[PDB]
UniProtKB/Swiss-Prot annotation:
Family: Belongs to the aldo/keto reductase family. Aldo/keto reductase 2 subfamily.
Keyword terms, alphabetized: NAD, NADP, Oxidoreductase
Biological processes annotated in GO: pyridoxal 5'-phosphate salvage
Purpose of the protein: Catalyzes the NAD(P)H-dependent reduction of pyridoxal to pyridoxine in vitro. Is not able to reduce 4-pyridoxate, and to oxidize pyridoxine or pyridoxamine. Has Kemp eliminase activity towards the non-physiological substrate 5-nitrobenzisoxazole, producing 4-nitro-2-cyanophenol; this activity is not considered to be physiologically relevant.
PANTHER family: AFLATOXIN B1 ALDEHYDE REDUCTASE (PTHR43625), ALDO-KETO REDUCTASE YAKC [NADP(+)] (PTHR43625:SF40)
GO cellular component, one term: cytoplasm
The enzyme's E.C. designation: 1.1.1.65
Organism: Escherichia coli (strain K12)
InterPro entries given in the database record: Aldo-Keto_reductase (IPR050791), NADP_OxRdtase_dom (IPR023210), NADP_OxRdtase_dom_sf (IPR036812)
Pfam families in alphabetical order: Aldo_ket_red (PF00248)
Active site positions: 56
Protein's name according to its UniProt entry: Pyridoxine 4-dehydrogenase
């Protein structure tokens, strides 16, 4: 169904561009023709929310979006994330100095062929681990808030953040979305989701199917099979019903998977089925 991200209405089934790049999201995709076809099919299928980044295989994924879809319809929101850069070892490195953040916003503009960015996520990276960790994001966000004032960024969002950091952030600028690790398993952000929901702020789970145990995965496949659905389709359908402020950005290099992802909007999840799925993380 739909949600208002910033000032643009988006279809809650969106498209994550992360697969349109070589392995490790690094360098060119296997087949740029297929990349182009997938983006175009996505819009044809009703996608109007595309999630991307200029540190995806750096620069290449943005340029493919541009080749494939420019000039973009009024309908399309392109969300990009800054705050990291790509080492030449394909590592993901913190890049949140004022110069780096400005450079990141600048590359996005040139590679997407835009004058202004609809939504820009600050991808927070506190500490040595690979998820949300506490630490002030004010310095980084302030730099973003200024590019918003200079008219280069329309709306500001957050990726990989604690509830505290979200609170901090909202004192500095308006936050239209939070993009975190979350799915049927990993539900630590449950309360934040509902809280954000109350304030009309979107929540954007990274990966519908990341990190399931054999048994968790096995329970999902059971459920999917009974419904004649794919586990990814059940994963997505569950995410959609879980909360009205949730926006999905599943990524794929494949038209078939794009098609079956989009079909998830039709997948009806019974209350009985919901009982089984709600118990997977417990």
């Amino acid at each position: 169904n739909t949600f208002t991200l910033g000032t643009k209405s988006v279809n809650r089934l969106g498209y994550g561009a992360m697969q349109l790049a070589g392995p490790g999201v690094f360098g060119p995709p296997r087949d740029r023709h297929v990349a182009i076809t997938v983006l175009r099919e996505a819009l044809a299928l009703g996608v109007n929310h595309i999630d991307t980044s200029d540190f995806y295989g750096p620069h290449v994924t943005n340029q493919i979006i541009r080749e494939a879809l420019y000039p973009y319809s009024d309908d399309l929101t392109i969300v990009t994330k800054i705050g990291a850069r790509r080492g030449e070892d394909a590592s993901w490195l913190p890049a949140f100095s004022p110069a780096e953040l400005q450079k990141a916003v600048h590359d996005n503009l040139r590679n997407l062929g835009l004058d202004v960015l609809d939504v820009v996520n600050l991808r927070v990276m506190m500490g040595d681990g690979h998820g949300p960790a506490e630490g002030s994001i004010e310095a980084s966000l302030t730099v973003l808030a200024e590019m918003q004032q200079q008219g280069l960024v329309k709306h500001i969002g957050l990726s990989n953040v604690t509830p505290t950091q979200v609170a901090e952030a909202r004192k500095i600028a308006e936050i239209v979305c939070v993009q975190n690790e979350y799915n049927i398993a990993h539900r630590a952000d449950d309360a934040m989701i509902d809280a954000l929901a109350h304030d009309g702020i979107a929540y954007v789970p990274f990966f519908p199917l990341g990190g399931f145990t054999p048994l968790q995965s096995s329970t999902l496949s059971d459920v999917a099979a009974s419904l004649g659905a794919t586990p990814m389709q059940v994963a997505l359908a569950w995410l959609l019903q879980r909360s009205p402020n949730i926006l999905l950005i599943p990524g794929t290099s494949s038209v078939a998977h794009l098609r079956e992802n989009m079909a998830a909007e039709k997948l009806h999840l019974s209350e009985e089925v919901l009982s089984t799925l709600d118990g997977i993380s417990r």
